[PDB]
Amino acid sequence: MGRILFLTTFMSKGNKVVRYLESLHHEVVICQEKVHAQSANLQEIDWIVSYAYGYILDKEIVSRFRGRIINLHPSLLPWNKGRDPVFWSVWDETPKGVTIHLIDEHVDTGDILVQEEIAFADEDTLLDCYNKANQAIEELFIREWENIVHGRIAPYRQTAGGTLHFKADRDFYKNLNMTTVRELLALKRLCAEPKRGEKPIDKTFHQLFEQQVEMTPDHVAVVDRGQSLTYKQLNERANQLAHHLRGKGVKPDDQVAIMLDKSLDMIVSILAVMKAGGAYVPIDPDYPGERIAYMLADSSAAILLTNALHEEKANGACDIIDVHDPDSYSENTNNLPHVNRPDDLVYVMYTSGSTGLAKGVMIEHHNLVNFCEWYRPYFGVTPADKALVYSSFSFDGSALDIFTHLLAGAALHIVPSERKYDLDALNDYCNQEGITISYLPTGAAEQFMQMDNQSFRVVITGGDVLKKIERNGTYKLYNGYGPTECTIMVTMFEVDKPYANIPIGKPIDRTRILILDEALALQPIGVAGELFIVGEGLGRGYLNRPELTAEKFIVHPQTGERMYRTGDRARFLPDGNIEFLGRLDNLVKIRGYRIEPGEIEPFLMNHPLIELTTVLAKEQADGRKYLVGYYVAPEEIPHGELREWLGNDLPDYMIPTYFVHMKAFPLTANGKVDRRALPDVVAPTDELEQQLAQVWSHVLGIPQMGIDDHFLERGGDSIKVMQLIHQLKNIGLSLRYDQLFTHPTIRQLKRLLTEQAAA
Numbered sequence: 001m002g003r004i005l006f007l008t009t010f011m012s013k014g015n016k017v018v019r020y021l022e023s024l025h026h027e028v029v030i031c032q033e034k035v036h037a038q039s040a041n042l043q044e045i046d047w048i049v050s051y052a053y054g055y056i057l058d059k060e061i062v063s064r065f066r067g068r069i070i071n072l073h074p075s076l077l078p079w080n081k082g083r084d085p086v087f088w089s090v091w092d093e094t095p096k097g098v099t100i101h102l103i104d105e106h107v108d109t110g111d112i113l114v115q116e117e118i119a120f121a122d123e124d125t126l127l128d129c130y131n132k133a134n135q136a137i138e139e140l141f142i143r144e145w146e147n148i149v150h151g152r153i154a155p156y157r158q159t160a161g162g163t164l165h166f167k168a169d170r171d172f173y174k175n176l177n178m179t180t181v182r183e184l185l186a187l188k189r190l191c192a193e194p195k196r197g198e199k200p201i202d203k204t205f206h207q208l209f210e211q212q213v214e215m216t217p218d219h220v221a222v223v224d225r226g227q228s229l230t231y232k233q234l235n236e237r238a239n240q241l242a243h244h245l246r247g248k249g250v251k252p253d254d255q256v257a258i259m260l261d262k263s264l265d266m267i268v269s270i271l272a273v274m275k276a277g278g279a280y281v282p283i284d285p286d287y288p289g290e291r292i293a294y295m296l297a298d299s300s301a302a303i304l305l306t307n308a309l310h311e312e313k314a315n316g317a318c319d320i321i322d323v324h325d326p327d328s329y330s331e332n333t334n335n336l337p338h339v340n341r342p343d344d345l346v347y348v349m350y351t352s353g354s355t356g357l358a359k360g361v362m363i364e365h366h367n368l369v370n371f372c373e374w375y376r377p378y379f380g381v382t383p384a385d386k387a388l389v390y391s392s393f394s395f396d397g398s399a400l401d402i403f404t405h406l407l408a409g410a411a412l413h414i415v416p417s418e419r420k421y422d423l424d425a426l427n428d429y430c431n432q433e434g435i436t437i438s439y440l441p442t443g444a445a446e447q448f449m450q451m452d453n454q455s456f457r458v459v460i461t462g463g464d465v466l467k468k469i470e471r472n473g474t475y476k477l478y479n480g481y482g483p484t485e486c487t488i489m490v491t492m493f494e495v496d497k498p499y500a501n502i503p504i505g506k507p508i509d510r511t512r513i514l515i516l517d518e519a520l521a522l523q524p525i526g527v528a529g530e531l532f533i534v535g536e537g538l539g540r541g542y543l544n545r546p547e548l549t550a551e552k553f554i555v556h557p558q559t560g561e562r563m564y565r566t567g568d569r570a571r572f573l574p575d576g577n578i579e580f581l582g583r584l585d586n587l588v589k590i591r592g593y594r595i596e597p598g599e600i601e602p603f604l605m606n607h608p609l610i611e612l613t614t615v616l617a618k619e620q621a622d623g624r625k626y627l628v629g630y631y632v633a634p635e636e637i638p639h640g641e642l643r644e645w646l647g648n649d650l651p652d653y654m655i656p657t658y659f660v661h662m663k664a665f666p667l668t669a670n671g672k673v674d675r676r677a678l679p680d681v682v683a684p685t686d687e688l689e690q691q692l693a694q695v696w697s698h699v700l701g702i703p704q705m706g707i708d709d710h711f712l713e714r715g716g717d718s719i720k721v722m723q724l725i726h727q728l729k730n731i732g733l734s735l736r737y738d739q740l741f742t743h744p745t746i747r748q749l750k751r752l753l754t755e756q757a758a759a
């Protein structure tokens with residue numbers, strides 16, 4: 001006999017429990033609603049049995065039914081009180097079980113009536129576990145109910161401790177419902193927040209460098225052509241320049257612009273800016289003065305380090321310090337007093353952001369120190385090593401080249417433009433000088449694999465999708481990834497096999513990588529999503545662009561971690577390696593350069609003849625993209641003019657390699673234009689001229705190219721020039737990079753045989 005109120009919100013009314021209870025001639029009132037004290041279905045009730053009831057009973061009821069309200073909670077009850085107990089048992093790797101217990105004032109803290117341990121298998125899904133747990137607790141209830149109703153079971157207190165979860169705690173994990181135990185813990189291990197006690201970065205870059213100098217002062221720090229500087233020599237010179245900089249009022253977090261070509265003076269001035277206390281802003285002297293003015297405007301830089309050669313390219317915009325004027329260097333050669341702390345800026349580099357002119361990416365000392373401190377032991381760089389300073393001065397590839405190796409006591413070899421494009425000669429230099437390790441952009445690196453090289457032990461590549469891995473050296477090859485906003489690379493991969501999609505590898509020190517969906521929730525391993533970065537790699541954000549910083553540098557709503565929303569799509573592979581999958585937004589990597597097409601379209605448009613422009617990135621069927629500038633106009637505009645037009649405001653790498661005239665743009669009914677629709681794509685007298693035409697035909701993917709056509713106007717870019725040079729070397733005679741631009745048609749090139757007939 002006796003009446004039982006069965007409370008549930010998730011279990012059905014045909015539960016094994018309910019059917020069993022009335023089988024024993026209890027009338028079981030089933031209730032799936034919220035109840036209060038005065039409620040009409042509470043007067044003649046003897047037992048309350050709650051199973052997965054989604055509300056808390058007001059204490060008046062639990063007090064009126066002391067000892068007669070039992071709850072079924074599928075958890076080893078000290079552990080995983082509250083919601084989603086089985087899920088949390090797995091994730092938090094707690095003991096597993098089910099508990100029948102008495103209800104109290106608080107959430108599941110009442111004394112245990114019956115409890116029993118249960119086990120999950122690695123291959124059970126989260127839903128499987130949930131069911132197995134329910135099945136277990138229902139049968140436990142059925143076996144022991146007779147004992148409970150007769151009150152012959154001694155209740156015992158739960159052991160102190162345990163965990164508790166509310167409904168929302170599982171939001172972040174909402175996409176994991178169908179995952180298995182193995183996959184879920186694997187996912188956990190990959191994204192598990194490190195345990196407290198992880199060591200923070202306690203020093204700034206220039207601080208660690210000074211240490212490196214103290215230990216190996218007479219080792220060669222940097223080499224340019226025949227000239228070189230030791231660590232002691234380099235440290236002292238930078239110090240002298242640094243004192244002057246601080247004397248002119250440079251303070252921590254101050255921007256100091258540097259406008260120089262690759263040289264010893266460049267390394268000296270960079271180090272001087274750090275040691276002085278501020279952060280350096282690299283300004284390519286071959287940039288349009290307008291562009292140079294802008295970088296100087298956006299940056300608050302009151303001081304500019306430059307040579308007499310490039311001085312007015314700043315157009316009096318800023319106070320100038322000549323790196324070749326002896327007045328610029330102080331007598332003092334001792335290391336400056338430290339005034340910078342690790343979260344201070346170390347440098348500011350401009351990259352193409354999503355909208356407007358350009359963004360100044362702020363990178364901090366601890367960021368840079370983290371990357372170097374990872375780099376040295378990872379690649380086992382010793383003072384015995386020698387590294388090439390290849391990448392341009394305004395991109396973090398140079399930061400990779402310069403900083404990581406100086407802290408290892410290795411020697412930097414400045415690559416002058418003399419060999420920069422001629423990789424055959426660069427290779428010879430390497431074999432001659434014994435260049436053991438360096439970073440080459442994907443475009444250069446893929447071409448450098450062709451060189452007969454015995455010099456290298458390790459080469460690192462990144463910044464564009466790596467396609468080729470066949471190489472003629474015995475050195476190891478590495479592919480890394482990382483946006484400029486997160487301090488050079490956050491992820492590294494050792495290329496061991498060929499791949500259709502070469503992974504970008506695993507995260508570096510003090511960094512975690514999260515693949516999240518649009519709701520910012522975890523994606524299962526193997527499942528694509530947006531790539532999020534967490535840790536020491538994150539910069540301060542965009543200079544004077546706080547709104548944009550807020551968008552890309554988010555505080556995660558469920559986790560509260562500062563995270564960088566890359567805009568990159570990616571996935572975890574089973575081996576833990578990350579695989580890059582492109583981007584939804586129209587932002588592209590052109591020859592390793594970050595490029596927003598919408599940054600170029602407006603400069604194209606203010607041309608007095610065109611009225612509408614869109615520029616797109618297209619593939620070479622080699623897996624990477626080139627820029628095409630689409631413009632509407634009365635008549636075709638000569639490629640040369642457009643190039644110079646844009647060239648007055650934009651850096652050369654931003655200038656498209658193809659321009660397409662259209663009389664009209666195709667339009668979708670909804671929107672302005674449908675991008676998808678835009679179309680895609682004189683014999684020589686002597687035979688020597690002919691034998692130049694076909695190498696040219698190959699390099700530009702052109703059949704039977706006419707001699708009188710301009711190299712640039714036929715899709716020529718720097719890498720296409722490089723390939724042409726080596727193709728002219730392997731089966732022909734030698735040509736320089738700069739010579740090719742002065743003589744861009746084959747006709748002028750044919751004239752080059754005057755140079756060797758003169759010899």
Ligand SMILES: *P(=O)(O)OCC(C)(C)[C@@H](O)C(=O)NCCC(=O)NCCNC(=O)[C@@H](N)C(C)C
Pocket residue numbers: 391392395396397398400441443444461462463464480481482483484488489591592593594653717718719
């Ligand atoms: P032309 O393109 O003008 O000749 C230049 C080129 C491609 C031959 C090569 O020298 C070059 O300068 N390539 C791009 C240089 C660069 O630094 N791109 C940014 C690097 N991208 C990244 O993702 C890096 N930040 C990480 C470290 C891989």
